[PDB]
Amino acid sequence: VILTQLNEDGTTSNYFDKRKLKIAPRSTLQFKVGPPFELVRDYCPVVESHTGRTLDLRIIPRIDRGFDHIDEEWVGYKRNYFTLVSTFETANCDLDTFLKSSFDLLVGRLRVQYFAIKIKAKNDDDDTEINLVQHTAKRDKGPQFCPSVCPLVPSPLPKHQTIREASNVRNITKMKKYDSTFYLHRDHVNYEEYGVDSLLFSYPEDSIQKVARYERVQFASSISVKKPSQQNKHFSLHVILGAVVDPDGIPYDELALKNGSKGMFVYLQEMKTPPLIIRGRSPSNYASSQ
DNA sequence: GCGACATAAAAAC
DNA sequence: AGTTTTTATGTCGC
């Protein structure tokens, strides 16, 4: 009925089928590690502007809520939240050095303003994009929004337990405890240590995330979860690492820039999950029907 | 099948 | 120790 796997940090993931077992909304059993991500591809190379050294990049993503491993399928529920977190790392550059340096895209060199992550959902069989929506903790009593592009600096990915613990913090003392895990406050560095052209100082805001945390995420309410044949559709969640550049023949998305103009989010690397099944609102997807 | 509102149970404080 | 918050899901109306 409940199948248990030990996570990397010694917490457990407890996989259960909501058709058969109903668990309380805030039970820790609702937190669990989802499917592992795989490389789709690498895109534009990035080099350090004097040394010419290629920057090694790696996305480090994880799902922490919303998906169960049931009979060799990964299963989510249309009505319920998932959590997708990600960092990236630069194997050949320590953070402190990285932030003082400057980097170009090797297309012929566009200057990188900052690095950022976005997420997408797709139909895994035909590559059609599927809309994602997020809520605040207030859900229907607050606004709905689409996942945003998240500027980030390189960081290790927090353990599953840390993401759990930080999911619904309001208390100022507890917020302070987690601040250094999730944020870099540029306004607190010694500005004299940095050149005008340094990467740190081309990030758009002073508060810079170390971790992209997409919580309270759902597939859009309009998604059809079954094919006409009544077979389940297969979905996939994608994480894309990009370099944001000034636009003034490679994969990119347009982005609302900080100075008002049209920025370009140039793709660097993309990872995706294996195929995902999503259970819809049918009564037969719930233990209450039995 | 979906937008909307109701219930309810453990976390958070 | 009690109150408020958060989120899975139950249900109503079209």
Distances (CA, A) of A27 to A30, A183, A243: 6, 28, 39
Determined by which method? X-ray
Compute the C-alpha angle A27/A32/A238, nearest 5°: 130
Cite the beta strand spans of A150-205 per DSSP E.
150-151, 183-185
Alpha-carbon distance of A286 to A20, in angstroms, equals: 7
Q: Is the CB of A65 under 7 A from strand C?
A: yes
Q: Which helix (H) or strand (E) holds A97?
A: helix A95-100
Helix (H) or strand (E) holding A64: strand A58-65
Lookup: tokens for A276:
């995902």
CATH code given to domain A1-290: 2.60.40.1390
By the 10 Å C-beta count (0-12 exposed, 13-18 middle, 19+ buried), A217 is classed as: buried
- Collapse the DSSP code of A159 into the 3-class scheme (helix H, G, I; strand E, B; otherwise coil) and give the result: coil
Nucleotides of C under 7 A from a protein CB: 5-11
Å between A108 CA and B12 C1'? 53
Residue A183 burial class via C-beta count within 10 angstroms: exposed 0-12, middle 13-18, buried 19 and up: middle
Cβ of residue A257 near strand C, that is under 7 Å? no
Residues A272, A77: Cα–Cα separation, whole Å? 19
Nearby residues of A133 by Cβ (< 8 Å), 6 or more positions away = A144, A145, A146, A217, A218, A219, A220, A221
Buried b (16+ CB within 10 A) or exposed e, A235-256: bbbbbbbbbbbeeeeeebeebe
Contact A232, A219 (CB under 8 A): no
Rounded Cα–Cα distance for residues A66 and A28 (Å): 12
Q: Report the half-sphere exposure of A38 (CA within 13 A, side-chain side).
A: 6
Query: What's the rounded Cα separation, in Å, for the pair A59 and A241?
Result: 7
Residue A98 CB lies within 7 Å of the nucleic strand C: no
Closest CA to A200 of A100, A93, A53, A94: A100
Residue A280 contacts strand B, CB under 7 A: yes
